[PDB]
C-alpha cells in the first residue's frame, strides 16, 4: 500500500493546506467571559499530528 | 549589549528601552538558550519554578 500511496502523492495537482481550515474557524467572534470555548476544543482535537 | 554568550553580535537595536523593559526584552529573546544551557551545565533546582 505504501508504494501506491507514494506514487499517488508523487503525481497529483491536489495540495492540502491546513491553514485554510484554521483561518475559517479562528475568525469567528465569541464572548471571552464563557468558561468553555468550543473553538479551542475543536482546534485541540484536530491539531495533534498536524 | 554587543554580544551575549550563545548569540550573534550586533542584534540589539539602540532603541532598546532602559530599565526593566530593556531587561525583560533581552531575557525574552535570550530565554530558550539560557534554559537549555542551564540544564546541561548545572544540576536541577529542588522544586518547580
Amino acid at each position: 500500500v505504501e508504494a501506491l500511496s507514494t506514487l499517488l502523492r508523487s503525481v497529483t495537482p491536489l495540495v492540502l493546506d491546513p491553514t485554510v481550515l484554521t483561518n475559517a474557524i479562528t475568525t469567528i467572534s465569541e464572548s471571552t467571559t464563557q468558561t468553555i470555548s468550543p473553538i479551542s476544543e475543536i482546534l485541540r482535537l484536530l491539531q495533534p499530528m498536524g | 549589549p554587543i554580544l551575549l554568550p550563545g548569540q550573534t553580535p550586533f542584534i540589539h537595536s539602540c532603541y532598546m528601552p532602559p530599565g526593566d523593559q530593556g531587561m525583560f526584552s533581552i531575557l525574552n529573546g535570550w530565554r530558550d538558550w539560557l534554559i537549555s544551557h542551564a540544564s546541561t551545565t548545572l544540576p536541577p533546582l529542588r522544586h518547580n519554578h
Binding site: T32, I39 | S13, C14, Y15, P17
Partner: protein, 97 residues
C-alpha cells in the same frame, strides 16, 4: 484613559529615544495581545483586559523595538501562569505600594 496613561501605573513608560517616532498607531493596532489563532487560551486576559491589554502591548512593543532590523508585528503567545494569576499578583503589588 489612553494606553500610555494607564500603562504608566506600573512605571511602563515610553523611552525618550522613541519621542521622534509615530509609535501611536503601532501600539494601537499592531501589538496583538491576543491573536485568536496563535495565543494559547491560558493567556486570555478575559474581563480584566480593560487594564491588562495596555500592559501587554507596552511589553510587546518594547521587545519589538529592542531587536535590530525592520519593525515586525508583536504577538503575545503564552503566559506560563494563567493570565488570571498574573492579574491577581499585579493587583497585590498595586495594593502593596
Amino acid at each position: 484613559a489612553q494606553l500610555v496613561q494607564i500603562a504608566r501605573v506600573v512605571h511602563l513608560s515610553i523611552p525618550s529615544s522613541w519621542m521622534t517616532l509615530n509609535t501611536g498607531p503601532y501600539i494601537h493596532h499592531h501589538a496583538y495581545d491576543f491573536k485568536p489563532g496563535i495565543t494559547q487560551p491560558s493567556a486570555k486576559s478575559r474581563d480584566k483586559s480593560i487594564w491588562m491589554s495596555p500592559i501587554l502591548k507596552l511589553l510587546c512593543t518594547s521587545y519589538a523595538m529592542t531587536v535590530a532590523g525592520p519593525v515586525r508585528t508583536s504577538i503575545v503567545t503564552e503566559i506560563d501562569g494563567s493570565a488570571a494569576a498574573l492579574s491577581g499578583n499585579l493587583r497585590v503589588w498595586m495594593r502593596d505600594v
